[PDB]
Symmetry: C3
Subunit: 103 residues, 3 copies
């Protein structure tokens, strides 16, 4: 029942949008915030890369994190996309139960 | 020594609301600073219906001793019924920056 | 694999954000950097409600490199005391975390 935030990035809004809609429909996450207009830098096969991406912030619970990450990975176009889980130590009571009631 | 700090996530319907919300909690000294990232889209089922709304992502910084009050303040002034209100722990940061946040409160 | 963390840093503009990112990536203090332009930073400064348009940075590194990353980011940052906060990562895709660790 403990809530966690999940970070993921997608190559464009379309991919991010149905990636979100898919895990939401599967009830593996209660909410998804998409932030386009981003840029990520990193090395890949020896070269510094700079890609345009959409930042995804999903909310779920510890109990569903593994399943959410699996689902996101399988549907994600990349082989190994960004999939990170951050802990939440506190939140509005009403928002937390709505969120739990949604999974 | 500095009190532990936290990051608060909250979304507002538009830039004007995000700004009023931020100014309010900054004035109340419940938040040291706030970052507003407009252009966001939130997807979630609301009462069985898949919604897709334009949102302004807010990231507020404060200390653990003010988090409870910050959330309550944000909830009161927020137009939404059940606004997103989550708190993430900051396990480390630049000492000087952490002092400024503490001093600001 | 060492525990992974996320570092938040705010830059005054894209040029600075990208240079900071390129720099720490080259020094191997971070494995990835996500830059989000168009962000607004509100806070009080000696009586004035400051409203700066800045760039939100999200960097990925490990706990064994967090201090060095912060020190490199700070000194290369044009500001004297920029936002530098570390958030813990409690879990993640095994292959992604392995790649983050391998990158450092």
């Amino acid at each position: 029942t403990a809530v966690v935030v999940v970070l993921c990035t997608a190559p464009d809004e379309a991919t991010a949008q149905d990636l979100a809609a898919k895990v939401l429909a599967e009830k593996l996450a209660a909410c998804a915030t998409l932030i386009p207009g981003a840029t990520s830098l990193y090395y890949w096969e020896g070269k510094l890369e700079q890609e345009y991406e959409v930042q995804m912030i999903l909310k779920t619970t510890v109990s569903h994190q593994q399943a959410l990450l699996e689902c996101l990975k399988s549907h994600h176009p990349y082989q190994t996309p960004e999939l990170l889980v951050l802990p939440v130590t506190h939140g509005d009571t009403d928002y937390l139960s709505w969120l739990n009631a949604s999974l």
